[PDB]
Paper text:
The overall structure follows the conserved dipeptidyl peptidase (DPP) fold that is characterized by two domains, a C-terminal hydrolase with α/β fold, and an N-terminal β-propeller domain encompassing eight blades as observed in other DPPIVs. We validate the specificity of the motifs through applying qPISA to another member of the DPP-IV family, [name] [name], an orthologue of human DPP8/9, which reveals a related but distinct cleavage motif.
To relate the observed differences in substrate specificities of [name] and DPP4 to structure, we determined the structure of [name] to an effective resolution of 2.6 Å by single particle cryogenic Electron Microscopy (cryo-EM). [name] superposes with the apo structures of its orthologues DPP8 and DPP9 with r.m.s.d. E309, which structurally aligns with a serine in DPP4 (S209), is adjacent to the double glutamate motif that is required to position the terminal NH3+ group. Another significant difference from DPP4 is the presence of an isoleucine (I705) in the S1’ subsite of [name] that is oriented towards the P1’ substrate position. In DPP4, the corresponding side chain is a serine (S552), which is retracted from the substrate along with a segment of the loop. This difference is consistent with [name]’s enhanced preference for several hydrophobic and all aromatic amino acids at P1’, because the isoleucine may facilitate hydrophobic packing of these side chains to contribute to substrate binding or positioning.
Numbering used by the authors:
A (entry chain B), B (entry chain A): 34 to 123, 257 to 434, 465 to 918
Write the structure that this text describes.
């Protein structure tokens, strides 16, 4: 038994001041950092770190650098005092083969420039025909942010062609105002943009613009819908692409020679060579194959026997593994065999949003993976010829990526610089120095230095109740789950507090994580709330067996995991969580589930706040919806997972349901809200509605953000205080 | 002193059932009626009434008729038992001059048909160029619903030309959905559609399509913006138009001869004749001139001296009067003089939304006017040569018009059929029979019969507390005002009840009126509310002196009249109205004022419900906004009357402000709401928002209507019950 904690109520105007003061304070918990890290060897004996940061006193961006004192860093082979390095100030690529050549995308067209002069450009007769920029769905869901690639050895460029002409329109704006250009947005069951690759060949300043032959991909890939990845093979002689089926259940990697481009005539065991375009890997799942950036062509050892070898990723029931994938062709160019050599244990996943760094002098590949723990990223190295494996960072400390399709700032001989974070500590940038041994394959590392940007304030001394990181087993499935509790500012172990249950629950995202992202929720803990995060089946970085349970069953499985996880935490917490005062909140997919949970479990959740909620999957985009819901679109599958069928089950009482939505939200459209609101009207269900006419998917304006917080918080008080 | 009445609270679900049951009952207070009334003399000795009604058992429309037993009616010269007549079943015009000719507007183009065959049509190369249909602003604000006219004597047709190409666009739809054709909507300070008239001349089946010479109007009317009225003059020889300035402060009537049309060359005191187009009347106002349908050309008595004479309306400080307007031209065609002969006392207004019926055999004009009372319409007759005047309907009973630009179903010799209504009684259609006397000019009438449609249920026996119709004088202006109170279902004179104050307050509309339109508010009185209606300065049918006070001052004057009127009623009611529990509601302009009143008088109004509110006049249309706000648009005038400047004054506490709006509202655009919501977000002001994604200006869907009522009522309880 526990005593109900007093819950302190307050005025809306006081919630505004709370949210406003808080934003001033939350920014004081961090320092100016840098948005990119890279290392270069300017000289054989010097290593220089570069990063992008603001100029002190302003928000203007510039490139900063520091010299790494390698003679001194090399001596930090023990856990000695760490050195500080101070960094100082002072869409386009330069071809590695030629420093005078640049290529970039300007106004969604590809340009090639020499010494400041444009020598070649692509053109289109329509805004819906694009070059150098990935198709919207590809950039948005399949996470490719570039359409431009250079060969390393030679002055040749590869780029993407996009055709949006049959893509369905979406209007944005405010009713009664003048029309603006429509957005092109694919929907489930609708046609997507058409894609193909092209090349520009530069011969002594003479550009040629040559398309790929149209059936080169299709002929080998009968199910082809998307190009998910592309780039040059070694020595710049060949182009590979990774392609997928519409539902992303099938994936193939195919290697395309120069002769399979539509060149002008002026430019053109018994194992064989790359006779023509061929698949060098194929994979199929029962549910889906996820995209990743762990693709890297290896240099061929034998030109007579140009064994096809690359670093790739294979999905497994458990984890997502790096593998050395290799293949043999017949004399006639088709594959006779693939090997699928795993470089790691299946029990953990790689970070698919990260690229990899591959050595050739030594056969070492460096990558980010969940080696130590499901909630933590580590930097690891493996030898791709042996399968020998080691972890280069400490367990309990998480590697942080600042961007999708991120990179490690790794110097193959000396070490690397990166951000590391943990649940009890803000991200910090540190340098790990390599140590090499005789008669050994893998390096070891030592933490030798920190990097800070000069001219800025140092790190604040922060004081808080560290989040309780909890692992527990499901009582229904036997699966391990992770959850986290953020403690209220003034905590009494023998009192119970109102529950704020934050959910996302959708695929591709992990909420419970070993980082410092939980800081933003201190604002609720200062109001006497317990904030609980739980992951679930369908959640990212566990493996397909864990994710697959939501296949054609969205809103049916992950909602139960959230409910059971909450109840188990209530037992483990010693009963300081009050189950009679529970409010559930989420955004995007989380808004969808906040609706699902109150509709299905009105006796657990007193109220729900659903922001950016997806009411109908048929109104959402193609690549996301169909990999989970299947294809061809099935009316009864999509109907079962919609909110439409749950409107009847929504609470009859007022102040139990709140809907929050942007008017300009291009991700989850306002149409989803209007559908939900219209159903509520028909069914006689009460709802509170908050709209932000000038906001997108999230709320970015500082005052709009304050307002939103004040209303979520005010609403929550009324929901519980009864 | 008075005892607070218990206020009975209830659940949202109970408010839904109340509103739902009510709609079933409110329809039971009425019967099937008919949407048009007309009389014809099929034979010299027979008068036949025709009307449009549904076929019993269904909603299918058809034409019904009854023969009037004239001899029986003629003998009903006393207040005898009245007779019932039972009516039985069984965009285009037929030319009065020729029964074989028809003309109509189809798909917004003008067609002329003979014996079922099209002989002539207009055409356009764009959807924005229209013929036969009044321009949107003209149809919407200046109340003209037709662009097609026939000559009475001859086979000639007149029609309107509309050019919308420079009119600003307005997008409607749901964000994320495909674009639909933009609406053309003028805004204050923006360009309107261009208009001109054209003719089709039919000579033995040979059509000619002839434009008006472009400067015919402009040359005589330098301020010309709109054509507000048009039609043929007597004998079909000439065309007159009524035109206005952009701010509608100036108005002219000009008479245009056949020779001022471009024509094919084959067709084209010392007082004179219609030498050419000339103004025959001009009027100017310091504020504005209102439009009306009281224009009628009179037959000229002397062809040698074709005195220009017509029935017209002159605005006065008090009232809107019929006048016989006449003019003389010089020999050279320009006016030397106008007479302005008033046919009525200035103390009352004509019904400007009604047309008039004019006799020539006797110089009698029949019209609807506020002869007996400011809240009541009467049918009146006057002799246009003498000014002799009489009232043909009983005082205390109001004439009802079923439509804008309505007509009297008047037979000049026998009498008329019309709907009459009163505050204590549902509209009924009755026949008034004329009585003529020797050596007398005006007819008298007797109420002889009622007309009902056969096959339908008779009138219900209704029981209610009749509305208290109140007149009182302002303590600040000395002006007379009218107000009405609807009593709560179970009324205790010594108890006080919560106040529901309904407002419109805008120009062109009268809320307090002697009719049965108050029935819809019984639904609030059954919940224990007192419903109070008050008119104000700026309100319709009093005269320009009464209306002009809101000139360039919208939201500044009419709000005070509503506040003072409420307080005076509280005194006159004996204190049964509770001033500590006041909720104000209105729609459209009323929504605007509901915001104005709480922002300005938070100590009187506990809460406001603003539906369809206009937050910014610059977002509203040209013809309406500029006649009140002036032209050229002034930033500080429009700023002063906007809600933007009042957002700061809106209540800080929650549940005090509610905003209701349609998403597809083409009258008051959603942009008005998004502007208001955005300001609230910036200022930190709480609001409740209800949106109807599939509704227009009002809410028409039966379930959407039930839902809206339930939320307005639920909200009101929470606002007062504290």
């Amino acid at each position: 038994e526990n005593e109900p904690a007093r819950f302190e109520t307050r005025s809306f105007s006081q919630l505004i001041d709370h949210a406003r003061s808080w934003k001033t304070e939350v920014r004081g918990m961090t320092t100016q950092g840098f948005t990119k890290i890279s290392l270069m060897r300017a000289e054989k004996d010097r290593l220089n770190m570069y990063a992008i940061s603001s100029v002190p006193g302003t928000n203007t961006q510039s490139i900063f650098s520091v010299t790494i004192p390698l003679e001194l860093v090399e001596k930090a082979q023990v856990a000695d005092r760490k050195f500080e390095l101070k960094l100082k100030s002072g869409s386009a690529k330069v071809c590695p083969a030629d420093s005078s050549l640049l290529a970039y995308v300007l106004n969604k067209q590809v340009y090639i420039e020499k010494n400041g002069k444009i020598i070649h450009r692509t053109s289109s007769n329509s805004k819906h025909i694009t070059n150098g920029v990935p198709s919207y769905i590809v950039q948005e869901e399949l996470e490719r942010f570039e359409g431009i690639w250079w060969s390393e050895s030679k002055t040749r460029l590869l780029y993407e062609h996009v055709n949006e002409e049959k893509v369905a329109e979406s209007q944005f704006g405010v009713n009664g105002d003048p029309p603006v250009a429509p957005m092109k947005y694919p929907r489930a069951g609708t046609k997507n943009a058409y894609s193909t690759l092209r090349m520009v060949i530069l011969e002594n300043g003479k550009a040629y613009d040559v398309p790929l032959k149209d059936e080169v991909i299709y002929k080998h890939c009968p199910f082809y819908e998307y190009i998910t990845r592309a780039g040059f093979f070694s020595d710049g002689t060949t182009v590979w692409v990774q392609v997928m089926s519409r539902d992303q259940a099938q994936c193939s990697l195919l290697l395309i020679p120069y002769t399979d481009f539509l060149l002008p005539e002026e430019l053109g065991p018994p194992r064989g060579k790359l006779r023509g375009t061929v698949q060098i890997h194929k994979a199929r799942n029962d549910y889906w194959i996820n995209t990743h950036n762990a693709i890297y062509p290896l240099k061929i050892t034998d030109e007579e026997h140009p064994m096809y070898e690359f670093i790739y990723c294979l999905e497994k029931p458990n984890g997502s593994c790096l593998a050395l994938i290799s293949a043999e062709l017949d004399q006639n160019g088709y594959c006779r065999h693939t090997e699928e050599k795993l470089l790691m244990a299946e029990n953990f996943s790689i970070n698919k949003s990260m690229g990899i760094v591959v050595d050739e002098v030594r056969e070492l590949v460096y990558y980010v993976a969940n080696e130590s723990h499901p909630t933590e990223w580590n930097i690891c190295v493996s030898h791709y010829r042996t399968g020998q494996h080691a972890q280069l960072t400490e367990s309990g400390i998480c590697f942080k990526s600042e961007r999708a399709n991120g990179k490690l700032a790794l110097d193959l001989d000396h070490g690397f610089a990166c951000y590391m974070t943990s649940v009890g500590s803000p991200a910090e940038c540190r340098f790990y120095s390599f140590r090499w041994k005789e008669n050994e394959v893998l390096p070891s590392t030592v933490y030798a230095a920190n990097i800070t940007v000069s001219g800025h304030p140092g790190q604040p001394d922060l004081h808080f109740d560290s989040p309780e990181m909890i692992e527990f087993q499901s009582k229904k499935t036997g699966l391990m789950h992770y959850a986290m509790i953020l403690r209220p500012s003034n905590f009494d172990p023998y009192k119970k507090y109102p529950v704020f249950h934050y959910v996302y629950g959708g695929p591709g995202i992990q909420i419970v994580h070993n980082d410092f992202s939980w800081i933003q929720y201190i604002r609720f803990c200062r109001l006497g709330y317990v904030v609980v995060f739980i992951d679930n089946r369908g959640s990212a970085h566990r493996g397909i067996e864990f994710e697959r349970h939501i296949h054609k069953k969205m809103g049916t499985v992950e909602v139960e995991d959230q409910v059971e996880g909450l109840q188990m935490l209530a037992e483990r917490t010693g009963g300081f969580m009050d189950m009679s005062r529970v409010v559930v909140h989420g955004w995007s997919y989380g808004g969808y589930m906040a609706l699902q949970m109150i509709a299905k479990h009105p006796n657990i959740y007193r109220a729900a706040i659903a922001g950016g909620a997806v009411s109908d999957w048929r109104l959402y985009d193609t690549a996301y919806t169909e990999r989970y819901m299947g294809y061809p679109l099935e009316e009864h599958v999509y109907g079962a997972s919609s909110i439409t069928g749950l409107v009847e089950k929504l609470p009859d009482e007022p102040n139990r349901l709140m809907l929050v939505h942007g008017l300009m939200d291009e991700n989850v459209h306002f149409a989803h809200l209007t559908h939900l609101v219209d159903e509520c009207i028909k069914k006689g269900k009460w709802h509170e509605l908050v709209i932000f006419p000038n906001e997108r998917h999230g709320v970015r304006n500082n005052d709009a953000s304050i307002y939103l917080d004040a209303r979520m918080m005010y609403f929550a008080q009324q929901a519980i205080q009864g």
